[PDB]
Amino acid sequence: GPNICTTRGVSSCQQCLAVSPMCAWCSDEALPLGSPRCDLKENLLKDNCAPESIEFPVSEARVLEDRPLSDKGSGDSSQVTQVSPQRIALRLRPDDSKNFSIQVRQVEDGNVDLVFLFDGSMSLQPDEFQKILDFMKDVMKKLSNTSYQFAAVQFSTSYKTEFDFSDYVKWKDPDALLKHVKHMLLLTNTFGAINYVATEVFREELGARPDATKVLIIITDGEATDSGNIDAAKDIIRYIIGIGKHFQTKESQETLHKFASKPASEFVKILDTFEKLKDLFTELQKKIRSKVELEVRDLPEELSLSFNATCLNNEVIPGLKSCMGLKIGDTVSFSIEAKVRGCPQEKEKSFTIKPVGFKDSLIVQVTFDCDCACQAQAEPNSHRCNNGNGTFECGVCRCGPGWLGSQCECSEEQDECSPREGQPVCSQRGECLCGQCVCHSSDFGKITGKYCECDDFSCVRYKGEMCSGHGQCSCGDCLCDSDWTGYYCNCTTRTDTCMSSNGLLCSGRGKCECGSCVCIQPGSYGDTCEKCPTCPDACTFKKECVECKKFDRGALHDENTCNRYCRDEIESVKELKDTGKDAVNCTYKNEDDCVVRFQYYEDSSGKSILYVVEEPECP
Ligand SMILES: *[C@@H]1O[C@H](CO)[C@@H](O)[C@H](O)[C@H]1NC(C)=O
Ligand SMILES: *[C@@H]1O[C@H](CO)[C@@H](O)[C@H](O)[C@H]1NC(C)=O
Ligand SMILES: *[C@@H]1O[C@H](CO)[C@@H](O)[C@H](O)[C@H]1NC(C)=O
Ligand SMILES: *[C@@H]1O[C@H](CO)[C@@H](O)[C@H](O)[C@H]1NC(C)=O
Ligand SMILES: [Mg+2]
Ligand SMILES: [Mg+2]
Fold first, then answer.
1. Residue 156 and residue 192 in contact, taking contact as beta carbons nearer than 8 Å
2. Which sequence ranges are listed under topological domain Extracellular?
3. Secondary structure of residue 549 in the 3-state scheme
4. Does residue 545 contact residue 561 with C-beta atoms inside 8 Å?
5. Which residues have CB under 6 Å of ligand 4?
6. How far is the CA of 540 from the centre of ligand 2 (A)?
7. How many angstroms from the chain centroid is the CA of residue 161?
8. What are phi and psi of 285, to 5 degrees?
9. Nearest 5 degrees, angle CA 339-CA 345-CA 346?
10. Cα separation of 411 and 572, whole Å?
11. Residue 575 alpha carbon, nearest atom of ligand 4
12. Max Cα-Cα span within the chain
């Protein structure tokens, strides 16, 4: 029956391909007249069309470079590959989309250039400054004769490279490398320091390796005294340690989030004392190699991408471009859908997909396949179209100016210019010539269609932009980019703003729709459905947070995931009180077999709170 390949008044092979990626064009000359030439390939074969004449391009994502992900090579012979594939050729027909995938692995023996950026401000006592030095020495000694190479920068009011990568490779001894450090005893210009590291330290001239993953360990005891941005360090993995009394308040700790990589729970470490630097190495090493985050570079306007992530145990999480909690050697995979808007005239485009901090990347070469191959057999001024009037292109007559018709015979001088006899001709947007509608020009776009009923400028708008600027208008209907859905193309496919602290989209208690959680589990609420005093498992989950946050013990403390999973503030109380229905009371026995008692409460300002009785009830 009817079909949009047939209901658009297409009069060429190129037009036929441009109306939809599902359309095919029949071009054999010995074809019945009343048969549509632009149709589905199946219906194009319902009537006998020559198979060598059906023009039907297929989009492809052709893998070109596919060096495998490196396993456990020790001498860095044959070189390390941490992204695969490395180069893909993407060819798209008009408005089409195409899948491809990328695999990323943090290889154990992959090179790492690590820079210590350590605070030398006037707040630090001599022994505290010395404990910062001993911590840098401890990290280096435990990573001696590995793929790690090191530099160290002291920062206060100004910045000083105390030793560079070339120094480390040559001398190796941390005692000798840091023997000449003089405590600056000034301010805490953390912005300028990080910018200094990005542009002045990670340099080949100073021994930085171009293939190495870049890591920055920042050690500080006070809030920054300068301002600005650290955009120049966005391709560096940044782990910050805030030590001491000046980071007692939650507010002060959060001022460090802007300097570290995301999320803060993995890359911001708060220590109450300097003595705890002695026990940090193992946690630190796991954290700095636990995140894979894809970044898209040089994406042309006409292309759109959406991502699904496979981070753990082959589980697909849609709408995500990153993975966290990774162990060294883990492999993650992403499924990527690329879509083009229309058909760009440009020769060839290419963008890159690269994990943050990594050298290796996937280069995606993009070409477009919008023309029919039969156009190479186009004869202008053809005897098959009247007085050489036009071209016999792919089995039809592309007529010249002034005269139209099947063979370009009708000039100035019938019936079908209206869907029925009552309506005006050509939707009052075109003129009826030679029995066909020739649509008026428009200042806002193009009017097309058999009856000039289609245009590309009257789609619904959202916030002043047609199709929210995230889709193309095709005969009054928005055709959304790959990363948008909805009648208005204003519903994002991304789900990162739905990810909850427990690692599940909408805490596993709801569904992500347009990037916002719709909570389904009864009694659940909050932005990611993470608040649920009446949920039956609330006590057993909050119990682990009382252990790690208040008592510095438990599974979450040992696994270094207390910051990740435990976002509720803890308040010590002498007793639990009647705080209303938005709470639950919990008890459990500690390893001394004394009863711990606490209340999970949801506060009217939006804060989850755990009220913990100060003294456990012992025998
Ligand atoms: C790509 O793969 C996804 C799931 O992996 C599927 O939903 C989709 O239809 C596939 N094709 C395109 C063109 O995205
Ligand atoms: C992502 O998964 C959703 C289903 O969860 C699917 O509709 C979509 O096509 C997938 N996209 C890709 C690029 O795999
Ligand atoms: C999309 O636009 C429509 C119309 O303006 C609006 O009603 C709807 O809430 C929007 N959706 C989103 C997710 O912004
Ligand atoms: C928690 O315990 C307090 C004190 O015994 C009590 O008043 C309150 O009703 C309890 N909360 C709930 C939600 O039952
Ligand atoms: Mg020396
Ligand atoms: Mg200080």
1. no
2. 1-619
3. helix
4. no
5. 576-578, 583-585, 599
6. 34
7. 34
8. -65, -35
9. 85
10. 92
11. 4
12. 110
Residue 436 C-beta-side C-alpha neighbours within 13 Å: 18
Q: What is the 3-state secondary structure (H, E, C) of 76-92?
A: CCCCCCCEECCEEEEEE
Residue carrying structure tokens 């095709």: 474
**Closest by Cα among 245, 267, 499 to 256:** 267
Of 589, 590, 591, 587, the C-alpha closest to 600 is 587
Compute the distance between CA of residue 204 and CA of residue 499 in angstroms, rounded to an integer. 39
Q: For residue 69, what is the DSSP state? A: P
Q: Do the beta carbons of residue 236 and residue 112 sit within 8 Å?
A: no
Cα–Cα distance for residue pair 190/198, rounded to 1 Å: 12
Q: How was this structure determined?
A: X-ray
Partnered with residue 122 across adjacent β-strands are none
**How many whole angstroms from 357 Cα to the centroid of ligand 4?**
50
31 vs 606: CA distance, rounded Å: 71
Distance CA 545, CA 535 (A): 16
Nearest CA to ligand 3 atom 5: 462
Name residues contacting ligand 3 (CB within 6 A).
462, 488, 490-491, 514
Counting ligand 4 atoms within 8 A of each CB, the residue from 579, 601, 613 with the most, and so the one to mutate, is 579
Distance CA 317, CA 503 (A): 11
